[PDB]
Symmetry: C6
Subunit: 134 residues, 6 copies
């Protein structure tokens, strides 16, 4: 699937994380107020990160950061962290992406990892419905 | 498909059972109050077990343990047991997983077993509807 | 697809009939009052038989025996019989399964047979709707 | 797909026509009052003919003869005839099946023929809707 | 998909145009008042033409000529013409089929051509909706 | 999928852009007032451009230029520009198509590029909904 980002201010940044064993951001793009971006998940990229005031549209619904198979994480407060579990018999926990208040994350279940653990106060969007940690 | 677990208290534990001839738990993870976990069925794992106060969301619906193709078993009282039948001409009965009151189980129909027998008082969720043993 | 059986009394029995040229029951299982069973059609088995007071859930709907692609046969009275036609140019009639009052049958259209003839007073469930012989 | 026939009287007969270059009936079966038959289209058979008082259920709907991809033809009066066109560059017209009042026909679009011409007064059922020649 | 033609008068004619580089009519059939024809698009034929008072049923809806992936063209007045564009880098315009008032055309997007230009006053039916040139 | 263009005036022009590494217009066609065109995306072409008063119909809805997987861009004012990101590890920005007020653009996500950036004031149509930059 594909997602849409609209910038409500200047300073909105988006990051692309590689599909593979490790989860780090390799590219970053800057959006100005009123600009809109459309992107699709590809072989290289399986997840993205969003920071700043912006509007996000997805099949699950439309999400705004100012308000107070794939999944979406929105950080309600500071200290939000997410971990990913390795596929197969392996039992490692090596993924550490911290989301500050107002930031948003989107990721897909790939071969290298198809199970995720989430920490802190955040809002989760899924095909079933919307979930609030608090 | 994939499922979501939300912890309403500390002490919530989840177990992963291997896909194969035998059904035993090999890994266990601990969730704190307010944490949320998302996982998908993979080649290694075909079923899971849940104990403690937690909220579970599935395509069939949202299930809570505090209230008093794949299937979900919720133990209404103690003494709940489940058995699985072997595929093909074989007629063995070698699966014994006991669920205490408040515990929940989720499993998929795999090649090694695609028929299940359930004992005791429990609540069953399926694509057709919700069933109560009592 | 898969079906669900719930036992309203003790003495409920279920039979599994082999997928192949001949239609005979090779395995039988016993259910106690309040127990529930879930099974899926496999390579070995293409049809089943049910006797006694029980509740059956299917995509077509939920069926109870006490009330007075695949198909379901419920025997309204004694003397219910079913015959199956052989696939291809062959014109044999070699299937004889008699259903007593209250018994239920479920079968799938397989390569060896994809056409069925029914005798006696019975209730038929199909993807189109419910049919009564009387 | 598959169809269902229910007999409202004795003397109801059904015919099976072969899938191939020529369209003739090779087998015939007799149904008694209150009996029901279920059959599926196979490699050998691509069409059938029905005569007498009977009830027919199909995805398009339920049809009764007493009332006054595949298609269904019901003869409103005597003199109903149907012709089939050969696939490809050929322009022959060699199919002649006459339907008397009350008779019903069902056929599938096969490789040897995927275009049909109909004569006389008849009622036609299709995935789009019901059509009356008069 | 397949379409249905019903003749409201005598003199109704239907034409079949070949699937290939060139678009000419090779076969023609005559329908009498009250007759009905059903045909499916095949390898040889990708489009048809209809003239005279007739009733046409399609997934988009039912169309009548007397009223004053594939597409349907109905000529509202005389002088209606249609052109087809060649697939790939080629930029030819070699298709000229003129439709008189009351005539109807149906065609499919094939490998040799998947883009069409229409002239004159006509009514167009598509999966999205009905369009009127005027 | 395919799209439909209807011309509300003379002077309406449509352009076809090649599927490949570079995005330039190779062919151009002229439409007169009241004419209608239907075209489908092919191997050669993955996007188009529209200028002038015209009516466009798409699965997302019907769009008119006079009003004041694939996506549609409508330029609300002058200065609208769009950029496309290269698939894979590459991080180039080499696409520059400027849309004047009233012009419309349609494009598909291809192998060479599946992520787009948009500038200026424009109206965006997607399977999720309609988005306005302002
Ligand atoms: N390492 C496991 C992770 C996993 C899958 N399903 C689970 C259910 C519960 C806990 C862990 C898991 C895997 O093969 O993907
Ligand atoms: N051993 C059987 C189990 C089974 C399948 N379908 C059934 C129906 C009824 C009872 C048992 C079964 C198998 O091949 O899977
Ligand atoms: N012996 C036939 C039975 C059959 C199939 N379709 C039918 C329709 C009507 C009557 C009989 C049949 C076969 O090849 O399966
Ligand atoms: N002989 C033609 C018959 C046919 C197919 N499609 C048609 C549409 C209209 C008229 C005739 C036809 C064929 O190849 O099958
Ligand atoms: N010759 C072009 C025709 C075409 C396709 N899409 C278009 C869009 C606009 C104009 C022309 C076209 C092709 O490869 O099919
Ligand atoms: N070059 C990247 C572009 C991209 C894909 N997904 C993204 C998400 C955010 C930013 C850029 C991207 C690619 O080919 O996939």
């Amino acid at each position: 699937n594909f997602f849409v980002i609209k910038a409500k201010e200047n300073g909105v940044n988006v990051f692309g994380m590689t599909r593979g064993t490790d989860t780090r951001f390799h590219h970053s793009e800057k959006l100005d107020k009123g600009e809109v971006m459309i992107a699709q998940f590809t072989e290289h990229t399986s997840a993205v990160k969003i920071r700043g005031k912006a509007i996000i549209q997805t099949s699950y619904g439309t999400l705004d950061t100012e308000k107070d198979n794939f999944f979406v994480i929105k950080a309600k407060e500071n200290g939000v962290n997410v971990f990913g579990m390795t596929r197969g018999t392996d039992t490692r926990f090596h993924h550490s992406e911290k989301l500050d208040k107002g930031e948003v994350m989107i990721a897909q279940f790939a071969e290298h990892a198809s199970a995720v653990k989430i920490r802190g106060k955040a809002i989760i969007q899924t095909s079933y419905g919307t979930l609030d940690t608090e």
